[PDB]
Design a protein around this ligand. Structure first.
Ligand SMILES: [Cl-]
Ligand SMILES: [Pt+2]
Ligand SMILES: [Pt+2]
Ligand SMILES: [Pt+2]
Ligand SMILES: [Pt+2]
Ligand SMILES: [Pt+2]
Ligand SMILES: [Pt+2]
Length: 129
């Protein structure tokens, strides 16, 4: 599914991301924008052989099982395919484990390079929440 900006904000908020580990909603929306362009079906193969999946481009080296990432972990205990669903629940729960892991939202390179320190409030501007 390709979410609209406010639709995704509301779904993120319903699922408990707003101010989760102190990251305001706009941070999560901005991350999703630049990681997946709001498309739940996004995948992107890395040089290292792992793959990033879903609205928040969650990576198979650590977080999910795709069956083809040699030597990897599955810390969220899910198949990577679950991060592709139009229901963002699996991506939300995993992102919660990720953001709690020690580097916060710096684990999302696209957040770090395009969202961090910007006016991320703009990403929820005009949304009923
Ligand atoms: Cl990740
Ligand atoms: Pt829709
Ligand atoms: Pt939902
Ligand atoms: Pt939820
Ligand atoms: Pt765009
Ligand atoms: Pt969980
Ligand atoms: Pt509200």
């Amino acid at each position: 599914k390709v979410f609209g900006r406010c639709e995704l904000a509301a779904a993120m908020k319903r699922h408990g991301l707003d101010n989760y580990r102190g990251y305001s909603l706009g941070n999560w929306v901005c991350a999703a924008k630049f990681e997946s362009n709001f498309n739940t079906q996004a995948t992107n193969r890395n040089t290292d052989g792992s793959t990033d999946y879903g609205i928040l481009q969650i990576n198979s080296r650590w977080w999910c099982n795709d069956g083809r990432t040699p030597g990897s972990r599955n810390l969220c205990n899910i198949p990577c395919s679950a991060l592709l669903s139009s229901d963002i629940t699996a991506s939300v729960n995993c992102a919660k484990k990720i953001v709690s892991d020690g580097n916060g939202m710096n684990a999302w390179v696209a957040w770090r390079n395009r969202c961090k320190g910007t006016d991320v409030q703009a990403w929820i501007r005009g949304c009923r929440l």
